[PDB]
Amino acid sequence: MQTVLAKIVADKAIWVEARKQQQPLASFQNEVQPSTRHFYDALQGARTAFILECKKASPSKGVIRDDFDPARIAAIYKHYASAISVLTDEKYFQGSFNFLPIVSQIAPQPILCKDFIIDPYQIYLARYYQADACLLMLSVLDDDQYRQLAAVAHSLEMGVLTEVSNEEEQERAIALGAKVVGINNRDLRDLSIDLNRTRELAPKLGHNVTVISESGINTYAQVRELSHFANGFLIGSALMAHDDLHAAVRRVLLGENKVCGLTRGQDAKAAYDAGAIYGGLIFVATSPRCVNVEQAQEVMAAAPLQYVGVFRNHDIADVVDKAKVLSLAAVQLHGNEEQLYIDTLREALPAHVAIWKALSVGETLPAREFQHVDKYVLDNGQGGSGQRFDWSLLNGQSLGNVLLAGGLGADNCVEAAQTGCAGLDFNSAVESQPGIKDARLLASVFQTLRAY
DSSP states (O other): OOOHHHHHHHHHHHHHHHHHHHSOGGGTGGGOOOOOSOHHHHHOSSSOEEEEEEOSEETTTEESOSSOOHHHHHHHHTTTOSEEEEEOOSTTTOOOTTHHHHHHHHOOSOEEEESOOOSHHHHHHHHHTTOSEEEEETTTOOHHHHHHHHHHHHHTTOEEEEEEOSHHHHHHHHHHTOSEEEEESEETTTTEEOTHHHHHHHHHHOTTSEEEEESOOOOHHHHHHHTTTOSEEEEOHHHHTOSOHHHHHHHHHHOSOEEOOOOSHHHHHHHHHHTOSEEEEEOOTTOTTBOOHHHHHHHHHTOOOEEEEEESSOOHHHHHHHHHHHTOSEEEEOSOOOHHHHHHHHHHSOTTSEEEEEEEOSSSOOOOOOSSOOEEEEESOSOOSSOOOOGGGGTTSOOTTEEEESSOOTTTHHHHHTTOOSEEEEOGGGEEETTEEOHHHHHHHHHHHHOO
16 A cells, blocks of 8 residues: 555656646746745744745645635735745645745745655746745655755755654754754654654754744644744644634734723724734623623724623623624623523524633632533633732643633733643733723733744
8 A cells, every 4th residue: 555645746746747748847947046035044033933834725634725815825924924835736735836926926935835846847846936945855755866956946045944754854854964854743654643743853953953843733832832842833724724814823823812801992903913812892890891782892893803702690691692793702701600501501692602711710720610611711800900820720731721811911921821821811911091901011912922
């Protein structure tokens, strides 16, 4: 039997041979000029770097994005990427060499041609289509084909992402002198994914090599953890599978953050611009930050956040109503709603609306045993217009559906982002007056969230 990789590469040869027939090298070689972008350079840097990928389908998921427009992807990715990867394999990824120029005209970063490069012709063609870098894979190439292909890339001032998938490959990489090595956590021979590839292999690479971790990277917590192993990430599926690209991006690069207690549209805008995923609207009568339906409608129209309505032991009918009318993405139960309520509520709310549960942490952490609860908000509660719970308490728990809250602000956002939760919930600490958000405090916390 043939692995999946062998099969893709056998098909690539056939694609290569036909393409040369249709566009012989002799017909354009002379006009191919070197790249004017600096791949190697954009990946070097203080900060962890991101190569965001434009991919329509994959061999292990099929069509990932029906909804496929390179130009529009490029338009969003440019606000956050260090480099942009564009798949050009047609058959298994549904990419095209024609997408390169499109992406290149819109985004200014170096553009990486992602494909199964087995013949120098592919490299000239990529350069011809504006690519500034190409992927070379040690699982497909022997040491002499690699030198040759890499010399060809370098001759066109293009950078190379040298891909390895195992220990033997990683050794060869050191030996061949690759400046940018990408650890592929997915093994294309059998489609299996294992982040440990990165954990075990990245450190041997050494300070002189820029190490990029590829595949299977879906959360901000995974990004914070792995950034101690690698200098950057190549991410694509996790983003492509989402309608809202901006949101998907920020979710992985910054976490699922929420800015709670919004009472003005400008603040919601401010939050959105800074990178927040969620905006909280507080329907608890008691709150100085409370809003009514009209006022909510106003806040909401200023920015495309995902709004969360905050209730406290509120009447179900009304909770449902506000959900329908405001088009809330979620409802956050901040009182003492027990399972029966959750269940009924669940039964009554439209299925697209999520249910979140807020819980207060004393000397001990409450349990998160509820059925029908999609997310939890842990805090030193009863609102507090105040200041923090014992974070050491979080160790030993699964935190993938937990948002951390309580006293979160500029001055402590670093530590908070390091606890390992899914996201952070900001409220009072980023305010100038209750319900009034300080745009500068906001920009400040979100800036910290990316400082890694």
